[PDB]
Amino acid sequence: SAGFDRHITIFSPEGRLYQVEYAFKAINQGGLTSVAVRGKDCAVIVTQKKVPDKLLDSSTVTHLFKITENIGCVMTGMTADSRSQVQRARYEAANWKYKYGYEIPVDMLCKRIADISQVYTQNAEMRPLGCCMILIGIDEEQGPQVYKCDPAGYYCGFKATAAGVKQTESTSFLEKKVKKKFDWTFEQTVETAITCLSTVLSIDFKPSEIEVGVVTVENPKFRILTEAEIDAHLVALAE
Amino acid sequence: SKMNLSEEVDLEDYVARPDKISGADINSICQESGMLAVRENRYIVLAKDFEKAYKTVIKKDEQEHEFYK
Amino acid sequence: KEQNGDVKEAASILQELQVETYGSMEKKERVEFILEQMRLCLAVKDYIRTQIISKKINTKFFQEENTEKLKLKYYNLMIQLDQHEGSYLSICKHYRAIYDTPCIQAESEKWQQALKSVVLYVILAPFDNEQSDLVHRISGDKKLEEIPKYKD
Amino acid sequence: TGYDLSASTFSPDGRVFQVEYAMKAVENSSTAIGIRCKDGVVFGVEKLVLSKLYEEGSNKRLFNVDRHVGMAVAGLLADARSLADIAREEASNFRSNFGYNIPLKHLADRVAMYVHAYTLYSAVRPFGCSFMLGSYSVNDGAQLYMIDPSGVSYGYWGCAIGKARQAAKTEIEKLQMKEMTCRDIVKEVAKIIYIVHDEVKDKAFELELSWVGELTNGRHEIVPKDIREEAEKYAKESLK
Amino acid sequence: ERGYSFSLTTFSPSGKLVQIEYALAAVAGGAPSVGIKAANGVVLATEKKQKSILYDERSVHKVEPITKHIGLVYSGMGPDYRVLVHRARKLAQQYYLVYQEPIPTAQLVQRVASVMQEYTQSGGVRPFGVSLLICGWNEGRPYLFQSDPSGAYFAWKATAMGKNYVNGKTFLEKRYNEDLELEDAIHTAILTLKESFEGQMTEDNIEVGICNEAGFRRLTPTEVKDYLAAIA
């Protein structure tokens, strides 16, 4: 049964690609968790910021990457593979803008990244990148958009999603959340994201242990909240 | 026919569901509903615990990796 | 809420409180809360819940130092429950347990009333091996002379 | 076992075991530390002189990637030299394509991608060396970066790679590196290197210092002999 | 003969390419899909049931257009479906550039089957773990085909692939008549999916496309809801 799990191109007798599943398991090897919530007029990503050393430059530990002035991404999994996929996505966005004039939709960013991942899955040349990408962007005529891209090459839009070690619990908490109809304001969206992360981690969430990226209809620019804004959101959440 | 059940518990609402479940699944649903009623310290099985147990048992995707489907 | 006449609401409010969960809570305090739940349930006549709570409480606490009041109240509530149920033998056994308490034994009128209840309820019990055994045990008691009519 | 021969194979629990083997291969090398002072970066490398026949400065683990960038390689020496050549080529290409010295953050990113690209294919093995890139400029301050065999890179205020990474990190955290200029950070680095060195196991060794900072106008250069001797004297004076 | 289940370029002693059969098993373990051809056109329906409400139903569409008059649904791996869709669209555009006429359904099916075959003739490449059900309209006649990872394409009148495909086929041959219409086809396809659909058919849980004379069009969720109400 499990003797077919050494080459990504080998189908198991049950029709399962085990190497892709192993990349999915490697997604959790980063040890962190990221949650994305799409509000009525904004999208928000919050990721764990684990700096287990006073010597690290906390500025460069960021897992939030700006793929394009309007499209932001949060990475989960191995850091090197995630950064490689980030540069690939940035190059794809630049190529789209150069070849078609207008800015690439987040739809196409995740679609192209998933296509590259699938090509790596079908041709046994490169090991699949065990990094999950979550892209947020204000796509005109559709509002905010949040998309998730996996090592398998399956890209999907989400009202709210999560990735990392605590993915099932965060997704369950969000599923409990997005069901009770509510005014998904920007503050409400950040509140939902932070509450998801705190509930699944049971952490008091000092402002330096998390990173928040924000895109809004009012300003369709990928913005990373400063520590003061994180503190303000946390104290608003507590009361 | 052995469980306490209740008047408001209408098994038909669970029979009419189009989900393809087996006799083992039926027994699991009944036992889980009874345990849910017991945990909340209730000697009479209500419809809410039946619905919760049915939803718990019905979920059989687990991961599914969302690309095999 | 009970003092305002909301006996049903008070019983419902006290029912959701699970005493066993609070481990740090003192055993005597836990049993007092259990007995209060018993009393509220009997006031609202939820006899199935009262039976469940009776199964909750253990019978080895009443053989301790200061548990005389708790034992008396618990056995009075159990007597009321089985009085509604009609199990005369269980009522007789509960009254026998009451009569064996040192506090009731010391006071004259209280032990006399306890023995009266014991003999009357063992009389009420249907004839069987256990009822005959209890009749033999109660009859072979010297204090029955203090109640001549009941002894006869 | 079985999921262990190639860097393109994912273990059932989800990790590339060849990469981890490269990391613990780096772990067996001699310690090398890097500390960014208030106005620069100082690299201090211990070098185990395996044979007395080697001349002084042979197998130097300080590499000048660019005019302003220095490296503090640790691990396989040949892999370190190849990665130094790759970093030099990347810096030269950036200079020829953009007309100015490559920012150390971008250079670290590019060399990190080059390292990571060797952890994907079964035809090539992951790089067996982990290095430090340090630079200083009047427009970007002082920057230090660390790249492991996995290719993961972020900036550090001060760090060590090799055998006694943790032992040197304990003595690195007790410095207020945000404040002092590298003139004294040099002797502090020398003292840390001398403490972390195991004389009973590594036998003799040579300490090589390098720095890049405002005191060096921005160019990365080996520390002159006078300052090296002063720092070694300071380190030796701390025997008790 | 487990020793011959790994190489895609090695015949078993019984002369079976086992890896292609494993790809077909992966196809059969996919989401249920049905495709039925009536005298008025073709209907392709599929179950787009997400794992939770969080997934955006309208983000990705399973039933996709290739040309104005050709549509195509799938059963099997998801990511390979997009690659096959892109190659089918590119082949259609190449045929249009060469001949100035929209590509016939049979020719597109043949070229797509050849494309799928190209991934089964070498080691180190995996066969497309998806099966394609392609609808088209040319020369006043509906056309329905099924292309496989093996590169074999047939001309199904009415079929079902994916989970419980045997149940779908058994439901067919009963509710299927060659003289039906597109509306009756829609109803029959929805019922056939209902034979293998777990839960309520929410309008967002089912994707239906029609290949009629006017071309191929994927049904909007409003029309899907109307048809479901007419059926249930």
PDB file of C-alpha atoms in Angstrom, chain E residues 2-230:
ATOM      1  CA  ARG E   2       3.102  -5.755  -8.211  1.00  0.00           C
ATOM      2  CA  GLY E   3       6.603  -5.414  -9.683  1.00  0.00           C
ATOM      3  CA  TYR E   4       5.158  -3.895 -12.874  1.00  0.00           C
ATOM      4  CA  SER E   5       2.869  -1.321 -11.221  1.00  0.00           C
ATOM      5  CA  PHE E   6       5.537   1.411 -11.067  1.00  0.00           C
ATOM      6  CA  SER E   7       6.907   1.864 -14.600  1.00  0.00           C
ATOM      7  CA  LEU E   8       4.740   3.570 -17.216  1.00  0.00           C
ATOM      8  CA  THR E   9       6.910   2.131 -20.025  1.00  0.00           C
ATOM      9  CA  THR E  10       6.932  -1.534 -18.989  1.00  0.00           C
ATOM     10  CA  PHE E  11       4.414  -4.170 -20.047  1.00  0.00           C
ATOM     11  CA  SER E  12       3.330  -6.615 -17.369  1.00  0.00           C
ATOM     12  CA  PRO E  13       3.700 -10.328 -18.207  1.00  0.00           C
ATOM     13  CA  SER E  14      -0.083 -10.306 -18.667  1.00  0.00           C
ATOM     14  CA  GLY E  15       0.370  -7.278 -20.939  1.00  0.00           C
ATOM     15  CA  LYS E  16      -1.346  -4.641 -18.799  1.00  0.00           C
ATOM     16  CA  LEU E  17      -0.156  -1.078 -18.202  1.00  0.00           C
ATOM     17  CA  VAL E  18      -0.983  -1.006 -14.502  1.00  0.00           C
ATOM     18  CA  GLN E  19      -0.210   2.682 -13.927  1.00  0.00           C
ATOM     19  CA  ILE E  20      -2.874   3.749 -16.434  1.00  0.00           C
ATOM     20  CA  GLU E  21      -5.377   1.603 -14.538  1.00  0.00           C
ATOM     21  CA  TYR E  22      -4.295   3.300 -11.304  1.00  0.00           C
ATOM     22  CA  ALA E  23      -4.901   6.676 -12.951  1.00  0.00           C
ATOM     23  CA  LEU E  24      -8.357   5.428 -13.947  1.00  0.00           C
ATOM     24  CA  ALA E  25      -8.955   4.372 -10.334  1.00  0.00           C
ATOM     25  CA  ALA E  26      -8.005   7.893  -9.248  1.00  0.00           C
ATOM     26  CA  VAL E  27     -10.550   9.090 -11.814  1.00  0.00           C
ATOM     27  CA  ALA E  28     -13.233   6.818 -10.359  1.00  0.00           C
ATOM     28  CA  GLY E  29     -12.439   8.140  -6.883  1.00  0.00           C
ATOM     29  CA  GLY E  30     -13.302  11.669  -7.974  1.00  0.00           C
ATOM     30  CA  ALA E  31     -16.383  13.824  -7.608  1.00  0.00           C
ATOM     31  CA  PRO E  32     -19.458  12.362  -9.358  1.00  0.00           C
ATOM     32  CA  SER E  33     -20.282  13.831 -12.754  1.00  0.00           C
ATOM     33  CA  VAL E  34     -22.869  12.947 -15.393  1.00  0.00           C
ATOM     34  CA  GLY E  35     -23.188  13.767 -19.067  1.00  0.00           C
ATOM     35  CA  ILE E  36     -26.184  12.908 -21.240  1.00  0.00           C
ATOM     36  CA  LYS E  37     -26.964  13.677 -24.882  1.00  0.00           C
ATOM     37  CA  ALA E  38     -30.539  14.382 -25.975  1.00  0.00           C
ATOM     38  CA  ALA E  39     -31.867  15.087 -29.456  1.00  0.00           C
ATOM     39  CA  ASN E  40     -31.693  18.828 -28.693  1.00  0.00           C
ATOM     40  CA  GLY E  41     -28.150  18.937 -27.297  1.00  0.00           C
ATOM     41  CA  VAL E  42     -25.903  17.776 -24.475  1.00  0.00           C
ATOM     42  CA  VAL E  43     -26.003  18.331 -20.713  1.00  0.00           C
ATOM     43  CA  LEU E  44     -23.002  18.031 -18.385  1.00  0.00           C
ATOM     44  CA  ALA E  45     -23.635  18.190 -14.642  1.00  0.00           C
ATOM     45  CA  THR E  46     -21.266  17.801 -11.713  1.00  0.00           C
ATOM     46  CA  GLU E  47     -21.203  17.948  -7.917  1.00  0.00           C
ATOM     47  CA  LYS E  48     -19.318  21.018  -6.681  1.00  0.00           C
ATOM     48  CA  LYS E  49     -19.688  20.236  -2.982  1.00  0.00           C
ATOM     49  CA  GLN E  50     -17.126  22.028  -0.827  1.00  0.00           C
ATOM     50  CA  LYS E  51     -15.696  20.752   2.450  1.00  0.00           C
ATOM     51  CA  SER E  52     -17.123  23.758   4.332  1.00  0.00           C
ATOM     52  CA  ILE E  53     -18.943  27.054   3.873  1.00  0.00           C
ATOM     53  CA  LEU E  54     -15.539  28.786   3.956  1.00  0.00           C
ATOM     54  CA  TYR E  55     -14.748  27.667   0.403  1.00  0.00           C
ATOM     55  CA  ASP E  56     -15.973  30.195  -2.161  1.00  0.00           C
ATOM     56  CA  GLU E  57     -18.389  28.310  -4.409  1.00  0.00           C
ATOM     57  CA  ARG E  58     -18.163  30.799  -7.286  1.00  0.00           C
ATOM     58  CA  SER E  59     -14.350  31.047  -7.150  1.00  0.00           C
ATOM     59  CA  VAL E  60     -13.652  28.031  -9.388  1.00  0.00           C
ATOM     60  CA  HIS E  61     -16.077  26.512 -11.894  1.00  0.00           C
ATOM     61  CA  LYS E  62     -15.886  22.794 -12.648  1.00  0.00           C
ATOM     62  CA  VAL E  63     -17.839  23.002 -15.907  1.00  0.00           C
ATOM     63  CA  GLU E  64     -15.697  25.086 -18.242  1.00  0.00           C
ATOM     64  CA  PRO E  65     -16.010  26.383 -21.812  1.00  0.00           C
ATOM     65  CA  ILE E  66     -13.492  25.504 -24.509  1.00  0.00           C
ATOM     66  CA  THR E  67     -15.078  27.341 -27.443  1.00  0.00           C
ATOM     67  CA  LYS E  68     -18.390  29.136 -27.930  1.00  0.00           C
ATOM     68  CA  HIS E  69     -19.949  25.777 -28.868  1.00  0.00           C
ATOM     69  CA  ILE E  70     -17.853  23.309 -26.821  1.00  0.00           C
ATOM     70  CA  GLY E  71     -17.979  22.646 -23.090  1.00  0.00           C
ATOM     71  CA  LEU E  72     -16.166  20.163 -20.907  1.00  0.00           C
ATOM     72  CA  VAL E  73     -16.585  18.736 -17.388  1.00  0.00           C
ATOM     73  CA  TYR E  74     -14.310  16.310 -15.547  1.00  0.00           C
ATOM     74  CA  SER E  75     -13.947  13.656 -12.870  1.00  0.00           C
ATOM     75  CA  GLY E  76     -10.697  12.983 -11.039  1.00  0.00           C
ATOM     76  CA  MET E  77      -7.816  15.175  -9.905  1.00  0.00           C
ATOM     77  CA  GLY E  78      -8.582  18.883  -9.803  1.00  0.00           C
ATOM     78  CA  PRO E  79      -5.276  20.544 -10.711  1.00  0.00           C
ATOM     79  CA  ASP E  80      -4.816  18.363 -13.814  1.00  0.00           C
ATOM     80  CA  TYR E  81      -8.250  19.522 -14.961  1.00  0.00           C
ATOM     81  CA  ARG E  82      -7.034  23.105 -15.362  1.00  0.00           C
ATOM     82  CA  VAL E  83      -4.036  21.976 -17.415  1.00  0.00           C
ATOM     83  CA  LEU E  84      -6.290  19.941 -19.691  1.00  0.00           C
ATOM     84  CA  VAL E  85      -8.695  22.887 -20.003  1.00  0.00           C
ATOM     85  CA  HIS E  86      -5.858  25.208 -21.006  1.00  0.00           C
ATOM     86  CA  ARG E  87      -4.516  22.729 -23.562  1.00  0.00           C
ATOM     87  CA  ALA E  88      -8.009  22.185 -24.993  1.00  0.00           C
ATOM     88  CA  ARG E  89      -8.560  25.935 -25.335  1.00  0.00           C
ATOM     89  CA  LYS E  90      -5.146  26.359 -26.961  1.00  0.00           C
ATOM     90  CA  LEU E  91      -5.879  23.531 -29.407  1.00  0.00           C
ATOM     91  CA  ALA E  92      -9.244  25.091 -30.254  1.00  0.00           C
ATOM     92  CA  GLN E  93      -7.594  28.462 -30.887  1.00  0.00           C
ATOM     93  CA  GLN E  94      -4.904  26.851 -33.055  1.00  0.00           C
ATOM     94  CA  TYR E  95      -7.565  25.057 -35.105  1.00  0.00           C
ATOM     95  CA  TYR E  96      -9.495  28.316 -35.484  1.00  0.00           C
ATOM     96  CA  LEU E  97      -6.355  30.148 -36.616  1.00  0.00           C
ATOM     97  CA  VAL E  98      -5.515  27.456 -39.171  1.00  0.00           C
ATOM     98  CA  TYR E  99      -9.011  26.872 -40.577  1.00  0.00           C
ATOM     99  CA  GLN E 100     -11.029  30.001 -39.557  1.00  0.00           C
ATOM    100  CA  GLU E 101     -13.875  27.685 -38.438  1.00  0.00           C
ATOM    101  CA  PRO E 102     -14.630  26.588 -34.853  1.00  0.00           C
ATOM    102  CA  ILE E 103     -13.038  23.220 -34.150  1.00  0.00           C
ATOM    103  CA  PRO E 104     -15.382  20.224 -34.534  1.00  0.00           C
ATOM    104  CA  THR E 105     -16.126  18.419 -31.291  1.00  0.00           C
ATOM    105  CA  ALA E 106     -14.719  15.107 -32.534  1.00  0.00           C
ATOM    106  CA  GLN E 107     -11.464  16.729 -33.671  1.00  0.00           C
ATOM    107  CA  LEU E 108     -11.018  18.562 -30.366  1.00  0.00           C
ATOM    108  CA  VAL E 109     -11.695  15.338 -28.463  1.00  0.00           C
ATOM    109  CA  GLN E 110      -9.113  13.526 -30.601  1.00  0.00           C
ATOM    110  CA  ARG E 111      -6.475  16.210 -30.035  1.00  0.00           C
ATOM    111  CA  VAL E 112      -7.168  16.355 -26.289  1.00  0.00           C
ATOM    112  CA  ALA E 113      -6.944  12.557 -26.102  1.00  0.00           C
ATOM    113  CA  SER E 114      -3.589  12.732 -27.884  1.00  0.00           C
ATOM    114  CA  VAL E 115      -2.458  15.372 -25.378  1.00  0.00           C
ATOM    115  CA  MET E 116      -3.446  13.094 -22.490  1.00  0.00           C
ATOM    116  CA  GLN E 117      -1.641  10.208 -24.208  1.00  0.00           C
ATOM    117  CA  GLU E 118       1.558  12.270 -24.430  1.00  0.00           C
ATOM    118  CA  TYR E 119       1.801  11.995 -20.632  1.00  0.00           C
ATOM    119  CA  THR E 120       1.565   8.175 -20.693  1.00  0.00           C
ATOM    120  CA  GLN E 121       4.432   7.386 -23.097  1.00  0.00           C
ATOM    121  CA  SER E 122       7.430   8.195 -20.885  1.00  0.00           C
ATOM    122  CA  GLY E 123       8.790   7.522 -17.434  1.00  0.00           C
ATOM    123  CA  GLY E 124       9.101  10.331 -14.933  1.00  0.00           C
ATOM    124  CA  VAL E 125       5.802  11.882 -16.068  1.00  0.00           C
ATOM    125  CA  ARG E 126       2.439  11.029 -14.560  1.00  0.00           C
ATOM    126  CA  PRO E 127      -0.718  10.342 -16.600  1.00  0.00           C
ATOM    127  CA  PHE E 128      -3.509  12.890 -16.299  1.00  0.00           C
ATOM    128  CA  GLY E 129      -5.467  11.613 -13.312  1.00  0.00           C
ATOM    129  CA  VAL E 130      -8.719  12.996 -14.708  1.00  0.00           C
ATOM    130  CA  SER E 131     -11.366  11.937 -17.220  1.00  0.00           C
ATOM    131  CA  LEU E 132     -13.015  14.549 -19.432  1.00  0.00           C
ATOM    132  CA  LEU E 133     -16.644  14.617 -20.589  1.00  0.00           C
ATOM    133  CA  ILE E 134     -16.805  16.942 -23.594  1.00  0.00           C
ATOM    134  CA  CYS E 135     -19.972  18.338 -25.173  1.00  0.00           C
ATOM    135  CA  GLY E 136     -20.213  20.083 -28.513  1.00  0.00           C
ATOM    136  CA  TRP E 137     -22.645  21.084 -31.222  1.00  0.00           C
ATOM    137  CA  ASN E 138     -21.792  20.884 -34.903  1.00  0.00           C
ATOM    138  CA  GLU E 139     -23.704  20.241 -38.119  1.00  0.00           C
ATOM    139  CA  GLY E 140     -27.028  20.290 -36.289  1.00  0.00           C
ATOM    140  CA  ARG E 141     -26.110  17.352 -34.060  1.00  0.00           C
ATOM    141  CA  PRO E 142     -25.121  17.026 -30.389  1.00  0.00           C
ATOM    142  CA  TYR E 143     -21.834  15.333 -29.556  1.00  0.00           C
ATOM    143  CA  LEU E 144     -20.735  13.867 -26.231  1.00  0.00           C
ATOM    144  CA  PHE E 145     -17.348  12.221 -25.723  1.00  0.00           C
ATOM    145  CA  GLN E 146     -15.290  10.888 -22.826  1.00  0.00           C
ATOM    146  CA  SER E 147     -11.505  11.174 -22.942  1.00  0.00           C
ATOM    147  CA  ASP E 148      -9.458   9.077 -20.528  1.00  0.00           C
ATOM    148  CA  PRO E 149      -5.921   9.184 -19.096  1.00  0.00           C
ATOM    149  CA  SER E 150      -5.141   6.296 -21.459  1.00  0.00           C
ATOM    150  CA  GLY E 151      -5.889   8.562 -24.421  1.00  0.00           C
ATOM    151  CA  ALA E 152      -8.922   6.449 -25.345  1.00  0.00           C
ATOM    152  CA  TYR E 153     -11.978   8.497 -26.318  1.00  0.00           C
ATOM    153  CA  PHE E 154     -15.488   7.157 -26.904  1.00  0.00           C
ATOM    154  CA  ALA E 155     -18.846   8.652 -27.889  1.00  0.00           C
ATOM    155  CA  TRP E 156     -21.055   8.199 -24.812  1.00  0.00           C
ATOM    156  CA  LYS E 157     -24.760   8.776 -25.336  1.00  0.00           C
ATOM    157  CA  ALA E 158     -25.226   9.047 -21.561  1.00  0.00           C
ATOM    158  CA  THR E 159     -22.748   8.256 -18.808  1.00  0.00           C
ATOM    159  CA  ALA E 160     -21.494   9.032 -15.317  1.00  0.00           C
ATOM    160  CA  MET E 161     -17.939   9.107 -13.972  1.00  0.00           C
ATOM    161  CA  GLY E 162     -16.492   9.564 -10.512  1.00  0.00           C
ATOM    162  CA  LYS E 163     -17.820   8.225  -7.237  1.00  0.00           C
ATOM    163  CA  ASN E 164     -20.715   5.769  -7.615  1.00  0.00           C
ATOM    164  CA  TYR E 165     -20.388   5.786 -11.399  1.00  0.00           C
ATOM    165  CA  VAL E 166     -21.906   2.294 -11.414  1.00  0.00           C
ATOM    166  CA  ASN E 167     -24.938   3.723  -9.609  1.00  0.00           C
ATOM    167  CA  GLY E 168     -25.190   6.522 -12.165  1.00  0.00           C
ATOM    168  CA  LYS E 169     -25.033   4.085 -15.073  1.00  0.00           C
ATOM    169  CA  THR E 170     -27.626   1.852 -13.392  1.00  0.00           C
ATOM    170  CA  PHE E 171     -29.922   4.854 -12.953  1.00  0.00           C
ATOM    171  CA  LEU E 172     -29.355   5.516 -16.644  1.00  0.00           C
ATOM    172  CA  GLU E 173     -30.683   3.006 -19.206  1.00  0.00           C
ATOM    173  CA  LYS E 174     -33.882   3.583 -17.199  1.00  0.00           C
ATOM    174  CA  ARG E 175     -34.543   7.340 -17.233  1.00  0.00           C
ATOM    175  CA  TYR E 176     -32.663   7.919 -20.510  1.00  0.00           C
ATOM    176  CA  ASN E 177     -34.346   7.933 -23.917  1.00  0.00           C
ATOM    177  CA  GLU E 178     -32.669   8.926 -27.174  1.00  0.00           C
ATOM    178  CA  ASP E 179     -35.689  11.094 -28.101  1.00  0.00           C
ATOM    179  CA  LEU E 180     -35.559  13.361 -25.038  1.00  0.00           C
ATOM    180  CA  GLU E 181     -35.072  17.142 -24.988  1.00  0.00           C
ATOM    181  CA  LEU E 182     -32.625  19.506 -23.321  1.00  0.00           C
ATOM    182  CA  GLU E 183     -34.999  20.234 -20.431  1.00  0.00           C
ATOM    183  CA  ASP E 184     -35.670  16.530 -19.877  1.00  0.00           C
ATOM    184  CA  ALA E 185     -31.907  16.024 -20.146  1.00  0.00           C
ATOM    185  CA  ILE E 186     -31.294  18.617 -17.418  1.00  0.00           C
ATOM    186  CA  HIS E 187     -33.868  16.911 -15.205  1.00  0.00           C
ATOM    187  CA  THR E 188     -32.419  13.438 -15.807  1.00  0.00           C
ATOM    188  CA  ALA E 189     -28.846  14.591 -15.153  1.00  0.00           C
ATOM    189  CA  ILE E 190     -29.876  16.310 -11.919  1.00  0.00           C
ATOM    190  CA  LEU E 191     -31.681  13.150 -10.798  1.00  0.00           C
ATOM    191  CA  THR E 192     -28.668  11.000 -11.714  1.00  0.00           C
ATOM    192  CA  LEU E 193     -26.438  13.206  -9.577  1.00  0.00           C
ATOM    193  CA  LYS E 194     -29.057  12.982  -6.817  1.00  0.00           C
ATOM    194  CA  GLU E 195     -28.541   9.213  -6.872  1.00  0.00           C
ATOM    195  CA  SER E 196     -24.945   9.906  -5.759  1.00  0.00           C
ATOM    196  CA  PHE E 197     -25.208  13.282  -3.969  1.00  0.00           C
ATOM    197  CA  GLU E 198     -24.960  13.336  -0.164  1.00  0.00           C
ATOM    198  CA  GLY E 199     -27.003  16.194   1.282  1.00  0.00           C
ATOM    199  CA  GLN E 200     -29.380  18.815  -0.028  1.00  0.00           C
ATOM    200  CA  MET E 201     -28.708  20.038  -3.571  1.00  0.00           C
ATOM    201  CA  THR E 202     -28.029  23.659  -2.787  1.00  0.00           C
ATOM    202  CA  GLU E 203     -27.869  25.687  -6.007  1.00  0.00           C
ATOM    203  CA  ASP E 204     -24.163  26.253  -5.254  1.00  0.00           C
ATOM    204  CA  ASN E 205     -23.472  22.517  -4.792  1.00  0.00           C
ATOM    205  CA  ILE E 206     -24.245  21.572  -8.416  1.00  0.00           C
ATOM    206  CA  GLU E 207     -22.822  22.913 -11.687  1.00  0.00           C
ATOM    207  CA  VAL E 208     -24.686  22.281 -14.950  1.00  0.00           C
ATOM    208  CA  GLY E 209     -23.805  23.289 -18.492  1.00  0.00           C
ATOM    209  CA  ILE E 210     -25.783  22.921 -21.702  1.00  0.00           C
ATOM    210  CA  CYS E 211     -24.328  22.367 -25.182  1.00  0.00           C
ATOM    211  CA  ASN E 212     -27.159  23.420 -27.493  1.00  0.00           C
ATOM    212  CA  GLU E 213     -27.295  24.911 -30.990  1.00  0.00           C
ATOM    213  CA  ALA E 214     -26.639  28.423 -29.669  1.00  0.00           C
ATOM    214  CA  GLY E 215     -23.391  27.089 -28.168  1.00  0.00           C
ATOM    215  CA  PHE E 216     -22.165  25.985 -24.761  1.00  0.00           C
ATOM    216  CA  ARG E 217     -23.360  27.871 -21.692  1.00  0.00           C
ATOM    217  CA  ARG E 218     -22.874  27.110 -18.011  1.00  0.00           C
ATOM    218  CA  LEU E 219     -26.143  27.494 -16.122  1.00  0.00           C
ATOM    219  CA  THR E 220     -26.322  30.400 -13.703  1.00  0.00           C
ATOM    220  CA  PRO E 221     -27.192  29.439 -10.102  1.00  0.00           C
ATOM    221  CA  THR E 222     -30.681  30.923 -10.549  1.00  0.00           C
ATOM    222  CA  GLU E 223     -31.483  28.471 -13.349  1.00  0.00           C
ATOM    223  CA  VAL E 224     -29.976  25.631 -11.307  1.00  0.00           C
ATOM    224  CA  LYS E 225     -32.237  26.571  -8.389  1.00  0.00           C
ATOM    225  CA  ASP E 226     -35.259  26.705 -10.702  1.00  0.00           C
ATOM    226  CA  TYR E 227     -34.500  23.257 -12.131  1.00  0.00           C
ATOM    227  CA  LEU E 228     -33.906  21.824  -8.650  1.00  0.00           C
ATOM    228  CA  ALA E 229     -37.253  23.218  -7.490  1.00  0.00           C
ATOM    229  CA  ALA E 230     -38.922  21.745 -10.580  1.00  0.00           C
TER     230      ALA E 230
END
